[PDB]
Every structure is written in C-alpha cells, then in structure tokens.
Chains A and B, each alone.
Chain A
Amino acid sequence: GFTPPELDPNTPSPIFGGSTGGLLRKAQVEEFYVITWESPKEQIFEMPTGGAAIMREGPNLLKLARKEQCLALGTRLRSKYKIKYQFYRVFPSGEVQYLHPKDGVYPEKVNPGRQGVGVNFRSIGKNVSPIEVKFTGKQPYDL
C-alpha cells in the first residue's frame, strides 16, 4: 500500500532568470509536467532546457514541458546530488496525475505490488508469421 503525495502549490521554485527553453502553448491546452524534490541547501544545477539555475534549500517545485525532461533532471538530482524526487502530469483542467516513482519505489527495484503488462511467455523467435494474423486486427507480438 502506497499513497502518492499530493502536489502542493505554493511550493517554491528554483532561482532562474528565464529561458527560451520553457513552456509553450502545449502546456496551456494539452498538458505539462511538474517535478518536486527536497534539497539540503542552495545549489547550482543544470536545467534540462535553459542553462544554470539555483536549487533552493528545502522543497523545490519545477514545471517542465515533457515527461522526459522531468525524468532527466530527476536522474541527475539522484546522481550528482543525492536527492529524492517525484513528478506528476498536469492537465489544463487542474487535474493532477502522479507519475513517478509510481510505487514510491523506483521501477528498477522489483516491488511485489506490480502487475505484468506486455509480458509474453515465450522466446521471441516463437512469434507467428504475419500471414497467420492477416486480416485479423492482431499483431504476432500482441499474443
């Protein structure tokens, strides 16, 4: 059992002068992303989009344009610094969707509450020939 931490607005954002690498209309009408982390101090870190920003001591909130930017920055926060991070997807309705770490456990560490998806129980060479799924909507790897 794991309860995703809710996104807390009014969480401070890093010190940064602005860049052309930030959000666009996509964030207004489609979706954007938010990564939060806890920092032990004020540090300089490389922004996945602009140049250099100053991570604030304590909780940090950072809105990014793509999920991959959140995961890249988080990978670095966990690597260069030793910082726990989470990030979420945010729709223009205000709805928030917690994304990562999905279990509260990082996905490279096996966690027992996890259900198999897209797992085929056979060697890859035992997939059927296309002719055997022709005119059916299926793909030989969907089995």
Chain B
Amino acid sequence: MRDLKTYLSVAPVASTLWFAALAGLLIEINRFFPDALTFPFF
C-alpha cells in the first residue's frame, strides 16, 4: 500500500495524472469558451 502510493508518485505516473488533468481542464474550457483570440472581459 505504502509502496503502491510510492510507485504512483514516480515521475512518469505523476506526469500522466498531472497532464491528463490539465488536458481535461483545457478541453472543457475550450468547450464552454470556444475559439477566442482575445480576453474579452477587459
């Protein structure tokens, strides 16, 4: 259990989790706010 959390902390796994979260986030942002060349809220 402790060893498994350790394995899940290793560089490639933490990287896939981190960038997968980041990708879902950016995808959803471009889903609710698509296109957009500018920051329109000023």
> Do A and B interact directly, with beta carbons closer than 8 Å?
no
A→B interface (CB under 8 Å): none
B→A interface (CB under 8 Å): none
